Ligand binder design. Structure first.
Ligand SMILES: O=C(O)Cc1ccc2ccccc2c1
Ligand SMILES: O=C(O)Cc1ccc2ccccc2c1
Ligand SMILES: O=C(O)Cc1ccc2ccccc2c1
Ligand SMILES: O=C(O)Cc1ccc2ccccc2c1
Lengths: 154, 154, 157, 158, 157, 158
């Protein structure tokens, strides 16, 4: 009965995120994508739907929203692992502090997975920014999400 | 039927390694510690025995030796995940190259886990070096290993 | 007479900070902990509360004293006849931004900066993360001086 | 003439670190355009005219360099001038990682290349932001800024 | 007339190298790929084989030429009337050691260094890792020019 | 007198970056000991006497600094002199991470503290090893080494 939680704001979910979800789903019996309720572009409901749309082929993955401490979200679902994607060593050091804190306060482990090379430079933020000024980000987002993004801007 | 491989030379295994093994064993149904056959201090047999001694309380962990490509070792056992411990962002960038190569050539995923804070500075190499000049490393190694190390030096 | 200044906002002081204070006090004839007064971003504790929490935690360091200030840190340091800063570091990224600051402070005022690695046990605590965790009912009592933890619970109610 | 590069920034104000980069780009490309980014939603310390004047006064010895402002996507500014190279100065490994993301995005969306150059050691620690902050509280940054900038900065602060 | 030198051992040249060569050739009037001759560590391919593999892979770059040399790189660069080096970079750690070298080369000879980020697809390939993987029967054909891959298989038998 | 620190290295040869660190330590501690590490299993370019002579000649203006060689564990060298501080110069974040490991180990095994100081910008890029390599192939490193070193280095190479 293994399992992991994949956390984020996912505003919107990118192909980099989806790659991490797919890898987590391949290695744990159960995966929960945890969507933070927190000034964003998409509502929590929209963010959840976009993730659900993009993960239809992952039968052991579900999507849920929450707030407060991530470790409480994880433990209240009977799990004690987080899976997070990483691009750089700079990312590793900041996330490292959080992972060690989360282990300390709740015994929750964090597993980091290296970004697929093709998505090393995509982030929800840069994708939104580039799209806003007319740049083509269609290759960096699920087809679903891309059309939804065009809608919000226009 | 989940599983992961924890690779290394483990010459000797440290408490930092053992911490990673325990976390992997807690999150995967099956863990295999892969001991590289490669100028070291302990023979492969000694390294295996020291790991087996220190992991007696982990029923779902086994220890095996091998050489060649790690991804072949992993795939030949029906698995496609590696679990590796990390201390720094410098570690992340070098290991990152390897993880991406391993994914490319064999579809094998790599999950990195942050070192426990108390073992952030221990490595097989520094422990051997410090012990050689008379420094006390007893708190950094399994009790087992520590006595074996004293034997090799004296 | 040797000496160094240990700067910060200390909102609140953590065991990571205390570890740096103790190491500085062991190596310099005098240490001054310099608590930043910031007009804009008012934090959780007042400057007086922050000073009191540091003094409680450093009661056994007779050569360390606690003072508040604002503006340019190197002015604070030189006004007290000193020309060294001691700061704790956790990561390589920490070293890069702090490096820029140290070189700037050396350039503009001839004040040197000595960095010390945090004890492994406190490598992940920070004032901001401790407050955030505590706010949602996480237990950070092992990461803070005893008196700080008590005061922090009070401010949260 | 033929080869060319764009040196982007907010240059609010330009520093000696920036000037070093401009000089090195101008020595290696037939033309260099210093691209002054203006955020239409947030005024910097200096207006666009002031920023451009300060750069021109300290680049008078570089005949193949010119200065232009813009906004929006950098790659559009570069391509609309028939170029496809950006030259940017870098101080640290942390500098490299975030600029890396933007360089790969810019290549992806517009085929524009980015060349990074290590800043001169003497300027490894000046940035526009740190210079402004230090000057605000009275520190001496005169050796870090061109003559075209230092007293104009002090004037803004006073 | 602008120009730059792209240095390396290229044992063998990879698609990561080729990507850098193409970008340099697109931005400079001339590019010289400088192949290191090393008396001590003899690699897998001879200098002549390495040059031939680069020339095959750069056949469509008319302003790029391939030459060998040894000793101080900045001497090679200045002897050819140039004063720029172009090098590919993958990581922040790469930037730190290469940074030291670039500043040294600028100091001793006035030669500048321009760094370019590898294309994402080739960020993990290196000559050494490709050889190691190939030695044990791993498939690196997507990471090397077609002709290099053929030659590499031959040397392994 | 009372406070004190040890500045360790192989100093094969000492560079201006090292000297900067020595001067800064000597300004902040009552006594400073430069600890010259000798590997009994591998000769450097310079013998122990040569290394010590080159350091002494370039630290004559520092009355509270002395120079001693040793081998084995640094923390034993430090503690046997009644001190418990190491001062080391650092150039980069990568420098910090590996030195971090050794500093935490040294504190663990012997209670010895390590203080790091940022090298002066002008020397951010000299190391003993790179100076030797550049000089070997004829590059000019005269501005990176004290007078006590440069021509002795050229002599070794010739
Ligand atoms: O990443 C964090 O640590 C903050 C975070 C992110 C997502 C969440 C989702 C559900 C509940 C709490 C959450 C916290
Ligand atoms: O870490 C690596 O990539 C090299 C390595 C290490 C351990 C191994 C154990 C068994 C078989 C191959 C192995 C390869
Ligand atoms: O670290 C800085 O440069 C900001 C700072 C922090 C603490 C201070 C304490 C007293 C006076 C000035 C201060 C500045
Ligand atoms: O990169 C370096 O500094 C070493 C190197 C590499 C290639 C070379 C090619 C020709 C001549 C000297 C060379 C030096």
């Amino acid at each position: 009965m293994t399992g992991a939680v994949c956390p984020g704001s996912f505003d919107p979910v990118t192909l980099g995120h989806l790659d991490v979800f797919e890898r987590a789903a391949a290695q744990f019996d159960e995966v929960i994508v945890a969507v933070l309720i927190n000034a964003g572009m998409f509502t929590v409901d929209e963010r959840i739907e976009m993730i659900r749309e993009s993960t239809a082929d992952l039968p052991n993955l579900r999507v849920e929203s929450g707030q407060g401490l991530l470790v409480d979200f994880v433990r209240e679902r009977g799990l004690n692992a987080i899976v997070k994607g990483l691009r750089t060593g700079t990312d590793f050091e900041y996330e490292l502090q959080m992972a060690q804190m989360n282990k300390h306060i709740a015994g929750v482990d964090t597993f980091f997975v290296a970004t697929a090379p093709a998505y090393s430079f995509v982030s929800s933020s840069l994708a939104k920014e580039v799209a806003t000024y007319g740049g083509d980000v269609s290759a960096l987002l699920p087809a679903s999400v891309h059309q939804r993004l065009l809608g919000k801007l226009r």
